[PDB]
Symmetry: D2
Subunit: 345 residues, 4 copies
């Protein structure tokens, strides 16, 4: 079993990722840290805890509320995709009202949530990094501000951190900006810092991959088949969240079926075998006026003139799923949804 932490900004797809990571027996989630991105970090905190409560885990997994804005830029949310709440599609009154105390507070010695501070997670992560036999796994699927901040406070830990991310676009264009992907552009300095720090970094789920991991009619019916027998209430919840995500992806980006981005990065930690991988140098544009967040690589230059590479590698890039990859991913995701529905009843 692999001990890991999740850094995320839920967000419908982060919701899916938490489910997979928390319930996969291959992963052992230590905590969740929320960031700014799809919404304000206060909402993404609340949304991680809602995800956990729905899956009967809100009193088991500590959740930390992290940094509210990027290193050197202004926050940019994405209600256009994820609603003003960050998890549109459903009424969360019941989940909010039955929310157990956050075990993070116990760890921190806090009476209540008003004491939560962005750097709360630091000491917990540092214990996990120290304890790790090789490297400690972080899955990051929102802005990567929190990890940048950690590394600024703990630079000596970078070499013992392994990042597995949903971020970027390489061989296809971006989404919220022409050539850049949301998670990078909202704080490119963060990812630029991380790449230079000594972290072992994997672009596990760029749009390149995530734009082929779509929530089709076939997926929706497999979900209902795995869940409706055990928990109609849970079916209703997860379907509505996915339909809301679909509708905005259609109205905003023309997509017929929406991409379920973030679980794919958890899937990479669960089962790396399903992914193509290439080592390269990734530069994050920070100076560009219209192109900040662009992930610019030396892949062309290796292919052209291989033995003249100036810059050393600083990342793994996953451009495609290997054969059977899409199937492997959905079976793992739908099995988790089926187990969740069992626990809920």
């Amino acid at each position: 079993s692999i001990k890991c932490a999740l850094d995320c900004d839920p967000g419908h797809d982060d919701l899916a990722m938490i489910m997979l990571a928390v319930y996969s027996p291959k992963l052992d989630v230590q905590y969740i840290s929320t960031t700014h991105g799809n919404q304000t970090v206060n909402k993404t905190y609340q949304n991680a805890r809602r995800t956990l409560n729905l899956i009967k885990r809100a009193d088991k997994i500590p959740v930390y509320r992290g940094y509210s804005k990027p290193l050197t830029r202004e926050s940019v949310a994405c209600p256009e995709i994820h609603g003003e709440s960050g998890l549109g599609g459903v009424d969360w009154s019941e989940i909010d009202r039955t929310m157990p105390r956050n075990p993070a507070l116990d760890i921190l010695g806090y009476k209540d949530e008003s004491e939560l501070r962005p750097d709360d997670f630091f000491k917990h992560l540092h214990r996990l990094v120290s304890a790790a036999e090789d490297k400690f796994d972080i899955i990051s699927t929102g802005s990567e501000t929190n990890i940048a901040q950690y590394l600024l406070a703990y630079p000596e830990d970078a070499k013992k951190i392994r990042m597995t991310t949903m971020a970027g676009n390489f061989m296809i264009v971006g989404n919220i900006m022409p050539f850049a992907e949301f998670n990078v552009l909202i704080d490119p300095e963060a990812i630029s810092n991380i790449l230079q720090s000594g972290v072992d970094y994997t672009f596990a789920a760029p749009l390149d991959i995530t734009h082929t991991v779509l929530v089709t009619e076939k997926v929706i019916n497999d979900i209902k088949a795995a869940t409706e027998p055990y928990s109609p209430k849970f079916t209703e919840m997860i379907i509505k969240l996915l339909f809301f995500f679909k509708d905005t992806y259609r109205d905003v980006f023309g997509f017929i079926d929406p991409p379920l981005h973030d679980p794919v990065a958890a899937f990479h930690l669960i089962a790396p075998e399903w992914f193509e991988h290439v080592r390269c140098h990734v530069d994050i544009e920070t100076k560009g006026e219209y192109t900040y967040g662009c992930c610019c690589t030396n892949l062309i230059l290796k292919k052209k003139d291989p033995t003249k590479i100036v810059k050393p590698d600083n990342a793994t890039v996953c451009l495609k799923l290997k054969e059977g990859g899409h199937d492997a991913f959905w079976n793992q995701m739908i099995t988790v949804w089926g187990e969740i529905a069992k626990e809920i009843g």
Copy 2:
């Protein structure tokens, strides 16, 4: 018939574009102006004249040798490999441009030579004068700096940029834009009526297949086997690198597509939009940035270009029949 000028950096693609434009009865080429690219503007001059001589037109069309480097950056400089050009070079007629300029020979050619000829054409035009541009766009930027009042009477039709797909020589940008993005940025702000007629979006689907090669042979081999051999080699010179570097099974032909746009616009999708050219980006200069991906109350910066993202149905076939018919007529004249 449509009077026009060609600005280009031949270049095998540009060679194909000159052929189409010069031999199309729909177009009336007034001159050709060459620019820098992978090859020095001196070579691209020589290559335009080689193209013209091969097609029995070197003594009809004036060719100008333009600027050797970008507005504010460094160049990245035969330029028509695949072929022995000794015969073409040796039988080269005098460049009619020299007569117009009063020059004894070619060593007197200056980058701004084209200016007064273009200004006469712009003045004479009833609406706008058509320029087809398929290399760096430095020359046109320079012209507009010398003649700002003419921008409003210039219509540009270009091979440049990439919009819904990634770039080529840099991750998100296309060669012609990145080699001088300030040029295109200037032009877009100037009042020029500007059409991205042949971005990679379109040109990456205009590929030299087995079917194209045999149609070429069919149109050319009866009349000029030498010319068949030549045009195939030129089209396949960069084939291996296009495969191993950029994944193509069959290599693209970019620049003719922009001449095709002036010949027959009706084969192209078209959308008016605001294009920003990245100039500040370290790794992303030359990017053509639009909101085309997006389907509020946000201040819309006004349109400054037409973007052609795809060929309409039958467009690829319309293009090749026009291109291959030209190659067929050329091969007739050569024998």
Copy 3:
């Protein structure tokens, strides 16, 4: 008395500033936080504690070791040359910060340690809590990123920048700004009440002349000759490079001037203006850009361009009196 904290990168100048702030009865130093500069934040930690120990205060004031590098750029890293510190190091009392934090020893110090202490001070303040900042301003930028709602209740008084004269380590920019301009840019946008109290504009006219040196000796040599010797060497360590590189006959003392501003603001000219920090410039990052040159976007700082008349003398009498009291305590 005015409660305040010092953020600094000692540094001979910062050493002088700590002395003034700690021994002035007008100021009540709550803690010192160290930052990166020409020396690593580990050394600047050690140097703040050395300053405190020398002045018989290392067991009174908590010192925090802060961030080791800028927000988004690379560091440019003893830091108090001129002196043998073996005695001071060996007699160093436990850092009271450790007691506050529950740490056994100094290896457990973390850059964000100061945060909760500062937040208590900000909350407790009736209007705003005073920070004097005289190195890179990374620590304060980090704090504000963790605690954005506190910006409105923080008053900064800094040694940083250059406005009507050129810079020092770069043509148009001053060390403290250029080493992390994103930090100061952040702070200026945050809501902090910010004063450029001691730009080069002022500090380049606060020079260690023969007259200053003899006044120092007069105030100190009667009580502590070894302290006289120490403080002169520290003040003249960088003399040769200040002459050969930057033209000064007598070298400047920058950072005390910012503590002096909190002690006695009335000696300074002041103007409210909009300051833009260059971050995009290749050769000009750290430039503090205003329209101050012109006599014909909302204000975000106070700028102090010159000392009022008698200001130089007010400053030295305060500085030299502190050195005289220190020398008394040392003997």
Copy 4:
């Protein structure tokens, strides 16, 4: 006698520079080319010709109308200093009405001025560059766009061009922007191009020097003394122009006596021996948002760590006048004003 051309944007101080250069026997002016800057290049054309006509030379010196805007930015004029015309202070009706035909037109084969084109000067300059035994001298005291354009058309001539300029600020702050000087900031890409091209370039008159070359009451009375005996009309003209320049320099920048910048660069070609000189690497800021046009040098680094210098020298910088320099300058300037007044009567 030294053959040279003037590139300028008159402008009250350019007016003074033309006077000095044209009437100094040490200099042989081949032509004047006007640029954008203190005003639109059409006005600076008219203003060069007005200068020439006033000094009985409008039919002797060809004037070219050059480029109207910078290489890659939008024009910025300076009416705040120089009036909407570019030469406020005086009524120019008489000068305009008695303006002889521009000899440039004869050189170009043009019937009239509507045929003037920005690249007109090119062929004339190229003949002068070819004919020069070493290098051909250009004095440049406005935007340097025209010379950048020339070099883009004629790159092989750069090595045979010597520039002597009024531009920049090095050890003091700028004027129209905090850290940069008008002539550089209005087109920094131009100067950046020129510095990289192979031109032999001298910053002969930065603000460093020009801010100490002031039009005092002592200068004004010396002017009147040298001119009023021979031409009261000319005295009236040159005084009014200087007083207008003074008043705006006071209202705009608080200067009591205004700096007469541009003549100082002509003075450098007349008598270099009055100037300090240092060779260094000058970088022009082009990327800075608030600091474009800044002249950033490696002078600090040679002083600090001398034998590590990376970047090769690309300019001469004149930081101060040598002793007697200010006197030498005014005697030369006031003698010219005195000779002008003689010819006018």
